[PDB]
Amino acid sequence: MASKSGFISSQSDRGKHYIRRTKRFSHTKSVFLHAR
Amino acid sequence: YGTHYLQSGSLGGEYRVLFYVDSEKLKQNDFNSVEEKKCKSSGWHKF
Numbered sequence A: 001m002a003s004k005s006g007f008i009s010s011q012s013d014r015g016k017h018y019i020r021r022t023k024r025f026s027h028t029k030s031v032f033l034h035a036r
Numbered sequence B: 001y002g003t004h005y006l007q008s009g010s011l012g013g014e015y016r017v018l019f020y021v022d023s024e025k026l027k028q029n030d031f032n033s034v035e036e037k038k039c040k041s042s043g044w045h046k047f
Helices: none
Strands: A002-006 A011-015
Touching: none
Parallel strands: none
Antiparallel strands: A002 A011
């Protein structure tokens, strides 16, 4: 977000930044071997 | 001694194979992206 006013003189500014990041990873491996 | 005796027959060997392969593979990507912007500017004509 950004906001401005400008106009004797007056200047006003507001800024905001937000970031959220998520990484989730899962790996599953299974081996069953039987010989008889 | 069982129930019967062999009156006649044949001798030799027997061989058998059953063999079975089953592969399944799945790969799946689902990607969504929304990008939005709104911005505005105003002033009489001074401001």
